[PDB]
């Protein structure tokens, strides 16, 4: 079973919680979920939507189609009717509403709505959309929502305006009704989300009204949950892994995709710790809201000089501002993690959408040559373990580590087995830390492997400087010192490249002559696509890079060897991941599946991309689905 539900509405109609309630009920019944939120850079009024993919098995990707579209306004119908395959739940009050009356809709979308209707000679009303849907076997289910909100207000003897938000739960109730799961799980998920007794009871009645107004069409049965399951987003799971990794200082500046992580850390900043002699102790993570990103990076880097495991979190505009401070951390061999929530760029870009367009910048950030360790998480479970790994990398190689998490994963959520993030031990590797034997300590000893023994501020006299420096940390222009120190810092990256298995730096799935070369968020959509393609006799394998620096160059040579198709699948225009492969090995991708609209690549986009390439050697398939 793979069933795709979508709900939509105006931002600030609390529809996003509607969607978490629907998901919560389905999950309690035993179904895995993958969910996504799409929103405008906008607080109230614009169209948001929420796709939830339901399955008895763990689910890894979004789809280009919706089985059931739930709606209570005109705009959600107009924005998603071309993606709707089995059922529309809609509000009959809008049947004669024309596209032009939806004021909150971008004129570019209105033009495209009209284009899609005109294409088969329909006008521009909701009624016309209903015919468009009926031409495709879609069953439309109309509600007089006004009359239902009335009946509820009547019952709770209130005016309609107190209960108006219950349109949401009528839609959710009816959607869930189509599925055929038992009402109790929807009632419990209601009670559990709202606080106020009264909100609980009128929303419950609204779901009931929706649920009883429809037939059981999917006939889904309950499943038993054998192992504990969790529902989490990318932000939160990044926070969980850092805290698990021993993070105790984070500075940030608010920016949409990353503010959530630092607010979550701060709401839970007083951590239980099991310390020496097995004592419970509390320890606090210091979280600072910086005045700008230059301060954020520099507070983190200063913190780390005290021995604290420090990090910051940001997105593209903010990352650009941090470049100088990262260069300083490089020069002074400061452990620090920068969580890079990569969003739609350049400049302000698409603040609420995603992108993979800053990989090369990340690999070359700031002036000078120094190791920049760069990893990119491909899904939610990776984010957890990659967060701990980042922190260990930073202290083992005493240098900045950039942890890329695309926006798409930050605001997506998934339901998966808790044990995926508790089964293995949480290993903390602090690297070459030593006890100073006397009052004055040389922080920058030249060793063969690049890595100088480190002590913390307070433990002895040490010096850091932005200038080139000798082993004591004092400003030195001497040519030979310069030759030695500058090499020493860069040699760490050679040490990293010897010490880190190349197998840890990529995930390889399958064995075939068609390679899907990727990194980051497309992992999920590709793995799902491979299974469907397999079943039509198309053999493929995924090669997914996790660590771009040090790059797994020998393993990539060995693997991509005599392969006839190497298809780069990325959310950018230049296939930056394929560009790094080519710089490191000379191997060029043969074809590309590319998306730069800011919305995730879906399973079906990949299937259709791969077939377009196999059946006509299309060089670049350019994707663009999603409202």
């Amino acid at each position: 079973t793979r069933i795709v539900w979508m709900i939509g509405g105006a931002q600030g109609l609390g529809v996003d919680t509607s969607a978490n309630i629907f998901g919560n009920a389905v999950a309690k019944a035993g179904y895995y979920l993958f969910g996504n939120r799409e929103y405008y850079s906008n607080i109230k009024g614009r169209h948001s939507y929420f796709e939830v993919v339901i399955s008895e098995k763990p689910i890894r990707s979004l789809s280009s189609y919706v089985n059931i579209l739930a709606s209570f306004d005109a705009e959600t119908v107009f924005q998603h009717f071309t993606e709707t395959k089995e059922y529309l739940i809609y509000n009959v009050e809008y049947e004669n509403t024309t596209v032009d009356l939806v004021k909150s809709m971008e004129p570019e979308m209105a033009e495209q709505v009209k284009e899609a209707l005109s294409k088969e000679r329909l006008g521009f009303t909701i009624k016309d959309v209903l015919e468009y849907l009926k031409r495709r076997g879609v069953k439309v289910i109309g509600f007089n929502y006004t009359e239902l909100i009335k009946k509820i207000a009547d019952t709770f003897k209130v005016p309609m305006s107190v209960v108006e938000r219950a349109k949401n739960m009528i839609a959710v109730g009816a959607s869930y009704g189509l599925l055929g799961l038992k009402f109790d799980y929807l009632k419990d998920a209601i009670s559990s989300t709202f606080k106020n007794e009264l909100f609980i009871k009128f929303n419950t009645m609204a779901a009931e009204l929706g649920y009883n107004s429809v037939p059981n069409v999917y006939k889904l049965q309950e499943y038993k949950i054998e192992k504990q399951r969790i529902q989490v987003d990318g932000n939160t799971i990044s926070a969980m892994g850092k805290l698990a990794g021993g993070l105790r200082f984070q500075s940030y500046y608010p920016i949409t995709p990353a503010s959530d992580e630092s607010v979550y850390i701060e709401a839970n900043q007083n951590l239980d710790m099991i310390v020496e002699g097995n004592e419970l102790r509390k320890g606090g993570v210091v979280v600072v809201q910086a005045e700008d990103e230059l301060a954020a990076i520099n507070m983190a880097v200063g913190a780390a000089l005290t021995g604290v495991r420090s990090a910051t979190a940001t997105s593209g505009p903010g990352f650009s501002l941090m470049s100088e401070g990262i260069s300083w951390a490089g020069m002074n061999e400061v452990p620090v993690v920068i969580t890079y929530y990569m969003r739609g760029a350049p400049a302000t870009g698409l603040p609420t959408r995603s992108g993979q367009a800053d990989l090369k910048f990340a690999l070359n950030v700031g002036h000078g040559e120094f190791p920049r360790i760069v990893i990119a998480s491909g899904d939610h479970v990776e984010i957890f373990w990659d967060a701990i790994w980042a922190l260990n990398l930073a202290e083992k190689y005493q240098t900045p580590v950039i942890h890329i998490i695309e926006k798409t994963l930050a605001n997506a959520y998934s339901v998966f087995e808790e044990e995926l993030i508790t089964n293995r031990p949480y290993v903390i590797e602090r690297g070459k830390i030593v006890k100073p034997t006397s009052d004055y300590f040389n922080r920058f000893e030249v060793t063969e492997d690049g890595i100088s023994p480190r002590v913390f501020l307070g433990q002895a006299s040490i010096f850091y400087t932005g200038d080139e420096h000798n082993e004591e940390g004092h400003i030195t222009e001497n040519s030979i010192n310069r030759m030695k120190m500058y090499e020493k810092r860069n040699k760490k990256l050679e040490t990293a490249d010897k010490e880190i298995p190349e197998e840890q730096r990529v995930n390889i799935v399958g064995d075939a002559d068609i390679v899907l070369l990727t990194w980051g968020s497309p992992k999920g959509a590709i793995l799902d696509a491979m299974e469907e393609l397999s079943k039509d006799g198309i053999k493929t394998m995924m090669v997914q890079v996790k660590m771009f620096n040090p790059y797994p160059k020998n393993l990539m040579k060995k693997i991509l060897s005599g392969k006839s198709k190497i298809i780069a699948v990325e959310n950018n225009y230049n296939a930056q991941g394929a560009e790094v492969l080519a710089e490191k090995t000379g191997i060029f991708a043969t074809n590309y599946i590319l998306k730069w609209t800011g919305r995730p690549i879906t399973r079906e986009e990949v299937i259709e991309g791969i077939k377009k390439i196999l059946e006509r050697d299309e060089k670049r398939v350019v994707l663009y689905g999603g409202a």
Partner: protein, 275 residues
Amino acid sequence: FVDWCPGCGDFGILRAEEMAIRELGINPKSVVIVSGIGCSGKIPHFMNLPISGVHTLHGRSIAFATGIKLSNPSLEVIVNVGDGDGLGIGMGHFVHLGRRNIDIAVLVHNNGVYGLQASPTLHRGENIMDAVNPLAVALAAGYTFVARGYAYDVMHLKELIKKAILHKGSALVDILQPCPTYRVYKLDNVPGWDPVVRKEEEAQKKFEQAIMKSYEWGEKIPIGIFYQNELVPTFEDRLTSNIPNYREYYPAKQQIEINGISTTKIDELIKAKRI
């Protein structure tokens, strides 16, 4: 090699800072001097105690100092910044430290130039741009201790620097200091002069006084302390309201690993996300 020009001024500040640390009996190991870019920037590199030096990016000292201090509040953190450095490239960070009121002392080396072009504290003419009163900016920014020193009265400076480190909060000392390559008076000697706020109702009055004294400049140029209010909670006081044992178990002190295994429990975090 102490590589400043003969004549400088920076020699007097070094001397007076050194004496402040000594006479306080602060263990020097626990003292971090965080300094900007410029000739001013070199300073900790030339001291004769086992203090630590952090020579930072241009205008970014305050932000580094902030991270250092908040992660280990038992360190004694002093910022030395040139006038091009703080005030120019670092003005924003300069103002924001004032609102946080972190227990740090900031010392500005007002030479009037970019030694290592006209700086932010060069007067118009003599330069296309106006000068800024660091003291007035600091007052409006919320600094809880604001002072002017002068680099040639070494013995007075030494004691400003001392009161500035002991101040429970964010302290500025703007220090006057001539640059050879590119009459004054003292508020200690004024019978009225009480810049200390001792109860809350007193605060506006003292503020208003400081800000107007800070503008006085008709070669009746004051020095000493203009304002001091220890009744403002420090940033560290506010952290302690959210983190009860911050003072006893601050980030730099916490044991995060035993035999390479995390000591941090996230079970409750994970439990709260269960289906």
